[PDB]
């Protein structure tokens, strides 16, 4: 139901479905995953993590599959959006194509 486009700035993973392009914050995603494993209300939010990390394609595949099966895939436990999404339609329109 989705396609992984790859990593950007060692900070975001780009994934798309039939409607949207998602920029998935890999730090906020790992934060949510570890929270669902271990619901620790008191862990520091990873919005402060600045250094990038190059991920293997296998690790990206595992992270994005986990994300797609998450019960709360939209926001970290602190309420920061895990991703920013863009309608594919917008991208097509900007070069003159209908989607």
Of 7-66, binders to a second copy (CB under 8 A) are 8-9, 11-12, 14, 16, 21, 23, 25, 28, 47
Q: Are 80 and 47 in contact (CB under 8 A)?
A: yes
Cβ atoms of residues 16 and 22 within 8 Å? yes
Residue closer to a second copy (CB basis): 12 or 67: 12
Does position 81 interact with Mg ion (CB under 5 A)? The reply is no
56 is written with which tokens?
Answer: 């293997």
* Residue 55 in contact with Zn ion, rule: CB under 5 A: no
| Residue 80 found at the interface with a second copy (CB under 8 A) | yes
Counting beta carbons within 10 angstroms of the beta carbon of residue 22, is it exposed (0 to 12), middle (13 to 18) or buried (19 or more)?
buried
DSSP three-state, residue 4: strand
In the complex, the smallest distance separating the C-beta of residue 32 from Mg ion, rounded to whole angstroms, is 7
Determine if 76 is a binding residue for Zn ion (CB under 5 A). yes
CB of 95 to a second copy, least distance (A): 5
């Amino acid at each position: 139901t989705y396609e992984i486009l790859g990593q950007m700035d060692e900070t975001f993973i780009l994934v798309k479905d039939s409607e949207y392009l998602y920029f998935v914050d890999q730090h906020l995603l790992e934060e949510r995953i570890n929270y669902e494993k271990l619901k620790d209300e008191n862990l520091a939010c990873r919005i402060s993590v600045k250094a990038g990390q190059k991920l293997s394609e296998e690790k990206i595949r595992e992270l994005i599959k986990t994300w797609r099966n998450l019960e709360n895939p939209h926001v970290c436990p602190h309420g920061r959006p895990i991703y920013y999404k863009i309608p594919l339609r917008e991208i097509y329109e900007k070069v003159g194509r209908n989607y």
